[PDB]
Amino acid sequence: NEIERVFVWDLDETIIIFHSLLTGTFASRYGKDTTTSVRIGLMMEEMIFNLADTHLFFNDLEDCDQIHVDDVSSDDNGQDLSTYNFSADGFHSGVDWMRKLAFRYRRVKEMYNTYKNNVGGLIGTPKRETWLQLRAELEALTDLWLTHSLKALNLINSRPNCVNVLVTTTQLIPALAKVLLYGLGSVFPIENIYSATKTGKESCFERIMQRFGRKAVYVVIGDGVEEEQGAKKHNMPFWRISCHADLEALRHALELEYL
């Protein structure tokens, strides 16, 4: 490719897998209301899984959790599937089976590239007003974290020589449902999302470097410890993102071309 610097992101523990909300440990650490925080997380995890079951084949692709969306691109005899009836094919729970599985991921990809900047047309209103109301309800507890990290991502996405990728441990379909909904679709191309569920984040890191080559600068930006050791044993500069002030430094270091 033409990319010079690649930023690998691990937005779990804060955005994708925000398990601190549901356990209530987030509310205790930051001194917020426990009951309200869990209610926002329980509503969120519902509207996410409700979209994956009615749009992204969550029940079909529940166990067949791949790692990249283009993995089964070899069994795809590319066809106009605007008429392909998924409810009446040989799918259940396999060269003729992998083709039906591969079509579904391309249909998932079609939904991503189509409604990633127009969610209100994907989930018809008022499901947007109620759900955009949910953002301010949560960003009022996290001090606009998703908005803040979107600034650091758009400060990278607009650079033609720089790019960003995402490496989470959720299954690919639920992770795509969150990235689509949460608004991270404008900064994350769907071809740059990896699911470290069965393989771990280290193997997902090696898979990224093999794609972009050695002439590029790889930087890891995330929170937690799983990707810190995965970025250390691959000599990739790790960027902690725990505090809110650690993000202001990430922007200020990109404003001045220090990265």
Ligand SMILES: O=C(N/N=C/c1ccc(Sc2ncccn2)o1)c1cccc(Oc2ccccc2)c1
């Ligand atoms: O903001 C978000 N997480 N923040 C997490 C976090 C942990 C530590 C800190 S820093 C801090 N500073 C001061 C006080 C508290 N914490 O932030 C978030 C996560 C997911 C989705 C999300 O948006 C939406 C949008 C639409 C619908 C539903 C959610 C927003």
